[PDB]
């Protein structure tokens, strides 16, 4: 244009750019439309993420924190309370009378105290400490009172009268043709010989036996002389009668007796030396060191026990694995600090542009 | 007021100020456009490291509430497996998960037996369990079938006594010991020592293992050589010393140079004995020495013993977040957006 007195040839120089910055300041506020709206809905975006941790993560984890924490009772209730847990089980099945006494209902050391509790001699107490396994097979436990916080039962142990009187098991065999009827255990006793008619009232150990007293027979010591004289005028013993026939053989623990007779074919043998010998009509004895197998008729006997082999069931240990948690925060937060720099260096032009009031 | 020299100097001053107002957005928009990348990093961190993680355990840790609860609710079948793993078909006595208490009581009341015996079977509930049996018949993956077996009884309430025999002075000894039952025209006799069970008033024995006797054998306690009955005898001439412990007393057969002594644990020795048979009762007598063999008649007390523990307590911590004033601070910024419109709209009035 042309404006006289108002910079005539300079109105395109002066106010033309003023028109140009007019829309530029208008577009500046029209840039705020682009600026302010996307961040105002970004505020809604983080609230969506605030709403996702509101119900879908934070109420979730603590529900298992009660729920998983139950098995750290249940596994634990069957863990440190374990000694009561077995003793529930036998009186569920053994029905009040339990034999023999286990090792959770009596955990070893309270045998050692209750051995030393009783008013019985050290001469037996040391012996009971020696054979700790056999006396356990003769002990008994009986349930007395059982409640929810009460568990009370009777522990029962045997007491002993005699110590260290010698013994022997018999093995009788038919002799020509008669046979005996008298076999059992034998014990030295005060003025007497104890006799045990039943086959297994006594327990088995390499040097020791342990029997009952209410189940025994008493004998004079002259019955050692049934072994030489049959018809003892002092006191004869019992025999079963036969006429002139039976073949027999009796297996002992440490040898074998044969009573081979008539047309019965009898043969001693060895597993590495073959047949050692055969037998005649009449009683005879063999030892177990060279003899392992004996054929009587068609019946093969064994005297030494038979070896087998070894066998293996094998496994290998197992390894746990997981992975920890992680996040690369610092340079992420330094990038935040880089944006935090941008907020405060924004103030550089802010005060400088706003200086123009004065 | 100097139209050329004035009216444009401040216009030059606001020119770069408006240029700084557009150099503002470099500071403004860049840091938030990369903050958009920052929350996407956090969007990417819940993308793979949180939400695929937790739900894997939600089926993995849920397996044990099958596993414990397989062994929790199905417990009665779990015990009954393991006996037939070891007892091999024949199990004795019958346990209490093999057969719990109530279906014992019903099967007692099932059978065609009199109430006179049925009430007695309900009384001795523990002993009849020791005479009951069970055999595994059919065992499959969904099938578990086994035969329960219970005894039946013929006679009721006939009296009994256990014998204790001892050598009597030549000096002989007896032969016969065992249990004695009143029977129809007869006396039942049990030679074996323990076919009969133990209870304070009652015994329960078999019938395929017994001997039958006339009632004249009660007169064997007076005569030895009875013409009424061949009272059985064990010969001797050589003496032998003996003592037999009963349940409620003791018998001695002391003789000769054997020294025999009755005693009490609080009164010391009460007496000693002569050559011959004699009887003592258990109320004053507790210990008896025969030779060097000390016997006990009353059982020996011990003590009590305690194994003690104390209960345990579960502990955890709950979850939390202080959201509201945080969201009110968000609402504080939510205020700032819309009051910025007052800066927007009033400044944008100038078109007209």
């Amino acid at each position: 244009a042309i404006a006289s007195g108002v910079a005539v040839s300079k109105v395109l120089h002066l106010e033309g750019e003023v028109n140009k910055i007019k829309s530029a300041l208008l577009s500046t506020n029209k840039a705020v439309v682009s600026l302010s709206n996307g961040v105002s809905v970004l505020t809604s975006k983080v609230l969506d993420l605030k709403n996702y941790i509101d119900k879908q993560l934070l109420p979730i984890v603590n529900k298992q924190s009660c729920s998983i924490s139950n098995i750290e009772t249940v596994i634990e209730f069957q863990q440190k309370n374990n000694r009561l847990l077995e003793i529930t089980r036998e009186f569920s099945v053994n029905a009040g009378v339990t034999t023999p006494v286990s090792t959770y209902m009596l955990t070893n050391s309270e045998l050692l105290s209750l051995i030393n509790d009783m008013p019985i001699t050290n001469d037996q107490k040391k012996l009971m400490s020696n054979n700790v396994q056999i006396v356990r097979q003769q002990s008994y436990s009986i349930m007395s009172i059982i409640k929810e916080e009460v568990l009370a039962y009777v522990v029962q142990l045997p007491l002993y009268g005699v110590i260290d009187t010698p013994c022997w098991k018999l093995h009788t065999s038919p002799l020509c043709c008669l046979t005996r009827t008298d076999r059992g255990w034998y014990c030295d006793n005060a003025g007497s010989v104890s006799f045990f008619p039943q086959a297994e009232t006594c327990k088995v150990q390499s040097n020791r036996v342990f029997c009952d007293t209410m189940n025994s027979l008493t004998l004079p010591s002259e019955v050692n002389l049934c072994n030489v004289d049959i018809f003892n005028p002092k006191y004869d013993c019992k025999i079963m009668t036969s006429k002139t026939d039976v073949s027999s053989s009796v297996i002992t623990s440490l040898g074998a007796i044969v009573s081979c007779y008539g047309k019965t074919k009898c043969t001693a043998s060895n597993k590495n030396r073959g047949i050692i010998k055969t037998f005649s009509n009449g009683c005879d004895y063999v030892s177990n060191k060279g003899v392992d197998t004996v054929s009587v008729g068609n019946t093969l006997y064994y005297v030494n026990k038979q070896e087998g082999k070894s066998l293996y069931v094998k496994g290998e240990p197992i390894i746990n694995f997981y992975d920890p948690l992680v996040f690369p925060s610092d340079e992420f937060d330094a990038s935040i600090s880089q944006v935090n720099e941008k907020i405060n260096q924004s103030l550089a032009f802010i005060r400088k542009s706003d200086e123009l009031l004065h | 007021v100097s139209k050329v020299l004035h009216l444009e100097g401040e216009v030059n001053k606001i020119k770069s100020a408006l240029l700084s107002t557009n150099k503002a957005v470099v500071s403004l928009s860049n840091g938030v456009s990369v903050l958009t990348s920052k929350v996407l990093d956090l969007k990417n961190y819940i993308d793979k490291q949180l939400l695929p993680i937790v739900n894997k355990q939600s089926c993995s840790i849920s397996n044990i509430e099958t596993v414990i609860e397989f062994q929790q609710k199905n417990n009665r079948l779990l015990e009954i497996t393991r006996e037939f793993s070891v007892n091999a078909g024949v199990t004795t006595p019958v346990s209490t998960y093999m057969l719990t208490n109530s279906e014992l009581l019903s099967l007692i009341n099932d059978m065609p037996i009199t109430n006179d015996q049925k009430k007695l079977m309900s009384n001795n509930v523990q002993i009849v369990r020791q005479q009951s049996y069970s055999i595994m018949s059919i065992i499959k993956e969904e099938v578990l079938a086994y035969v329960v077996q219970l005894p039946l009884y013929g006679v009721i309430d006939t009296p009994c006594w256990k014998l204790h025999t001892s050598p009597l002075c030549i000096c002989l000894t007896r032969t016969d010991r065992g249990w004695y039952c009143d029977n129809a025209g007869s006396v039942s006799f049990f030679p074996q020592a323990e076919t009969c069970k133990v209870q304070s008033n009652r015994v329960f024995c078999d019938t395929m293992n017994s001997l039958t006797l006339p009632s004249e054998v009660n007169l064997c306690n007076v005569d030895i050589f009875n013409p009424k009955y061949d009272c059985k005898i064990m010969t001797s001439k050589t003496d032998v010393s003996s003592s037999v412990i009963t349940s409620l007393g003791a018998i001695v057969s002391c003789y000769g140079k054997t020294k025999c002594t009755a005693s009490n644990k609080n009164r010391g020795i009460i007496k000693t004995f002569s050559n011959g048979c004699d009887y003592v009762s258990n109320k004053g007598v507790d210990t008896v020495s025969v030779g060097n063999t000390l016997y006990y008649v009353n059982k020996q007390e011990g003590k009590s013993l305690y194994v003690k523990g104390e209960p345990i307590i579960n502990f955890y911590d709950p979850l939390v977040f202080p959201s509201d004033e945080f969201d009110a601070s968000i609402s504080q910024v939510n205020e700032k957006i819309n009051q910025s419109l007052a800066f927007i709209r009033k400044s944008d009035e100038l078109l007209h």
Partner: antibody
Amino acid sequence: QLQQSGPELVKPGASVKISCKASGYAFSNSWMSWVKQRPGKGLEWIGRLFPADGDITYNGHFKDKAALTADKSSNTAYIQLSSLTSEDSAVYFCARMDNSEVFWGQGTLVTVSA
Amino acid sequence: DILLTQSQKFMSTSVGDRVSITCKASQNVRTGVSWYQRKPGQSPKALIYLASNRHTGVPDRFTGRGSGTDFTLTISEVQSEDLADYFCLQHWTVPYTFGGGTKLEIKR
């Protein structure tokens, strides 16, 4: 039974073991013991041992003066009595305390070599 | 240990007399003790076993009782042959302590 050796002389600078042999008796499975006597002080327990297993005890007031050994083959005990004085001069007794054997040794007259 | 206290050291009676002797203890030891004799220059002899049992070859006029911490040794109808020294011994748990020892005399 048992048998115990003869007299002994202790010495400042000596330790010596004493022999006690099981005279014809089932030996390997029963205890032994020892007790000393001084008149004006009476009897005084020493200790006890078991043979062929080696359970050894001590009177703790006496424990450092002596040590306990034995032979299980020739059934002979030993006790190494270290350097003592005349206040320990006494007669010493090998003794078993069994219900089967309450036995006592022959004594061991011990003074100081001087 | 556990200490044992006897009543006195000497006695004075007539012959054929009944004498009651008791030593006591500090704690109940559950009947695990024994009594003895002793003769000068001679070996001792065990008399009352487990505080109850007269041992073999010992005359019948020799009695004893007690159950707690106190134990009675009662001898009856004494003679000139029985004038020995007498004592006890703790016999239940190691260490083993003696009684005070008591010499028996008459008329003094």
